[PDB]
């Protein structure tokens with residue numbers, strides 16, 4: 607079918623206990639050590655709070671899980687434990703329960719995030735290179751650990767723009783990659799869904815995250831956020847095809863023997879592939895370079911298996927100024 611070009615066998619080469627999250631037995635500490643201070647956020651599966659550990663005054667984040675989802679809890683816990691110490695991955699400090707209700711929660715390191723909508727309108731060329739490089743470190747790490755994030759988007763990339771700290775958060779959709787495994791396509795945010803998801807291709811891999819990263823890069827260098835702004839999942843693919851081209855979409859589908867939902871026939875139209883320079887204008891020109899466009903062109907590709915890996919992206923000339931500053 608399709609396989610990842612990198613890290614394809616790494617889970618099979620590890621002990622089964624590494625990836626068999628259903629067999630994982632977390633050690634649940636006591637949530638009574640934590641005082642909730644402020645609600646940050648809330649999703650269908652969890653609610654997130656700033657908190658203080660009253661035993662040592664440490665400020666933390668507590669994510670309270672909805673307890674009915676036992677397999678998904680084990681998955682997120684095991685993934686976070688496997689990733690501990692990875693560069694720019696949010697640090698899981700502990701797994702705790704309310705000692706009476708037994709409702710589980712995750713305790714994370716605190717980061718003071720700069721709201722992305724405002725931030726992405728004031729980044730410099732160097733800043734974009736720097737933060738994209740830092741995010742790539744996290745993705746290369748998790749991919750090397752056999753894990754796809756599957757929900758890369760600005761809201762899951764915390765950036766403290768004062769300390770220049772970045773953390774990739776919300777591992778609740780992440781999964782272990784196993785070659786030939788068919789995965790649920792109902793992952794990622796609409797605007798960050800790769801074409802593979804939108805055409806119901808289940809044999810995807812780490813490269814899904816590289817599409818999402820490309821979407822973020824485009825939004826930063828062009829100042830159009832989100833970059834591909836679909837109204838629903840059907841329209842999302844139309845928005846992509848109006849840039850990447852319809853003949854090019856059909857070549858991708860043919861290569862992977864992908865069946866297209868016939869509702870698309872009435873909405874895709876006919877679109878030439880657009881030059882990335884078409885998105886430049888006076889408001890973003892200072893963020894766009896030949897390097898940036900070359901990198902973007904190699905990320906925002908229909909063919910998931912031809913997109914750059916996180917490592918190949920990190921090795922692109924676009925990041926040379928960051929690497930050089932990092933050593934001098």
Ligand SMILES: Clc1nc2nn[nH]c2cc1Br
Pocket residue numbers: 646654667669696714715716717775776777778
């Ligand atoms: Cl703020 C925050 N939110 C999260 N949602 N899932 N994991 C998370 C980690 C942090 Br820190």
Ligand SMILES: [Cl-]
Pocket residue numbers: 781788789790
């Ligand atoms: Cl899945």
